[PDB]
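User: Hello! My lab partner asked me to get a predicted holo structure for this protein. The small molecule is 9UA, SMILES included with the sequence. Please write out the C-alpha cells.
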Amino acid sequence: IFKPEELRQALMPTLEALYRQDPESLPFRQPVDPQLLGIPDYFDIVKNPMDLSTIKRKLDTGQYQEPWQYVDDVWLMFNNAWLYNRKTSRVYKFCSKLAEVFEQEIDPVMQSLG
Ligand SMILES: CC(=O)N1CCc2c(c(N3CCCc4cc(-c5cnn(C)c5)c(C(F)F)cc43)nn2[C@H]2CCOC2)C1
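Assistant: Hello! Below are the C-alpha cells for the protein in complex with 9UA.
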C-alpha cells in the first residue's frame, strides 16, 4: 500500500525533471490538439492519448495507487509519440530525450519506494 503523499513526494521530482527539459518537453506539456496543430489523423493512430499535464493532475489528485501506474502513463505518452511521429521529426527525437531522462530519474525512486 502506498499513501497519496508518499507517491507524490517520490514521483513529482521525476515529472519535474521532464518539465525541465527545454525544448524537449514542449510538445508534451498539454494534450495533443489535432485540429489546432493541423494533424487531423492523430486520433486515428493514437487511441489512448497522454501528456505531462494529465499525469501531473493525476498525481495531484490521488489517481495513482501504485508507482507503476504512473510509470505506465509516462511510457504511454512516449509510445504514442514514437508511434505517431516520424523518426526524423522534432517530436520523436524530443520523446527519445525525455525517455532517457525519465529512465535515469525513475530508477533510484523505484528503489526507494520498494
Ligand atoms: C506529442 C505529439 O505526438 N504531438 C503530435 C505532433 C505534434 C505535437 C506538437 N507540439 C504540441 C504543441 C507544443 C509543441 C511545441 C514545440 C516547440 C515549441 N518550441 N520549440 C523549440 C519546440 C514543438 C516542436 F518540437 F515541434 C511541437 C509541439 N507539434 N506536432 C507536430 C504538428 C506540426 O509540427 C509538429 C504534439
